[PDB]
Design an enzyme around this catalytic site. Structure first.
Site, PDB file in Angstrom:
ATOM      1  CG  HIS A 269      40.717  42.568  47.052  1.00  0.00           C
ATOM      2  ND1 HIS A 269      39.932  41.528  47.504  1.00  0.00           N
ATOM      3  CD2 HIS A 269      41.810  42.670  47.842  1.00  0.00           C
ATOM      4  CE1 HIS A 269      40.563  41.035  48.551  1.00  0.00           C
ATOM      5  NE2 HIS A 269      41.709  41.695  48.796  1.00  0.00           N
TER       6      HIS A 269
HETATM    7  S1  FES Z   1      37.213  42.305  44.928  1.00  0.00           S
HETATM    8 FE1  FES Z   1      38.378  40.881  46.195  1.00  0.00          FE
HETATM    9  S2  FES Z   1      36.845  39.594  47.228  1.00  0.00           S
HETATM   10 FE2  FES Z   1      35.686  40.993  45.901  1.00  0.00          FE
END
Ligand code: FES
Length: 127
Positions: free
Chosen positions: A92
Site C-alpha cells: 500500500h
Molecule cells: S503498506 Fe500496506 S502492508 Fe505495507
C-alpha cells in the site's frame, strides 16, 4: 534453538541489509554508513507519526535491526527503496527511513525493533 538467533556481523558489509528468518518472519540486520546514521540523526522528530529518536531504536549506530513486517497490513518492506533510503512496502506504499520509522504512506507505526544485544564485536543475539 529457534527462539533466539545469533548473527555474525562481519558477514554484513556497510550499506547492506541482510534478511534472516526468525519466529516465522523476516528479520533484518542492516549495516549502516556514517551518512545514513547522520541523516537519521537530522530528522525532526516532532513531525513524525510515531515519534522516536534514531538512538532509542538502535544500540550501536552502525547497526539497525528490525522485524521485516510492515505495520500497516503485514507485507515485507523492501530495503533501499522509497523516498527516504530506508525501506518501501509495495502493498500500500508505506515509506520507511533507515531507522525503520514510518515516513509516508498508510502504516501507523515504525517497524518493530526486537530485543537484542551484542555479545562481542562480531556477534549480535536477537530474541
Ligand atoms: S503498506 Fe500496506 S502492508 Fe505495507
Amino acid at each position: 534453538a529457534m527462539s533466539k538467533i545469533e548473527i555474525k556481523l562481519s558477514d554484513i558489509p556497510e550499506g547492506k541489509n541482510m534478511a534472516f528468518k526468525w519466529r516465522g518472519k523476516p528479520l533484518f540486520v542492516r549495516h549502516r554508513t556514517k551518512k545514513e546514521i547522520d541523516q537519521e540523526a537530522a530528522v525532526e522528530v516532532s513531525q513524525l507519526r510515531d515519534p522516536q529518536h534514531d538512538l532509542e531504536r538502535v544500540k550501536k549506530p552502525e547497526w539497525v535491526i528490525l522485524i521485516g513486517v510492515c505495520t500497516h497490513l503485514g507485507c515485507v518492506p523492501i530495503a533501499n527503496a522509497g523516498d527516504f533510503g530506508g525501506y518501501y512496502c509495495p502493498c500500500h506504499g508505506s515509506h520507511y527511513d533507515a531507522s525503520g520509522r514510518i515516513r509516508k504512506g498508510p502504516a501507523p507505526l515504525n517497524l518493530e525493533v526486537p530485543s537484542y544485544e551484542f555479545t562481542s564485536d562480531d556477534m549480535v543475539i536477537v530474541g
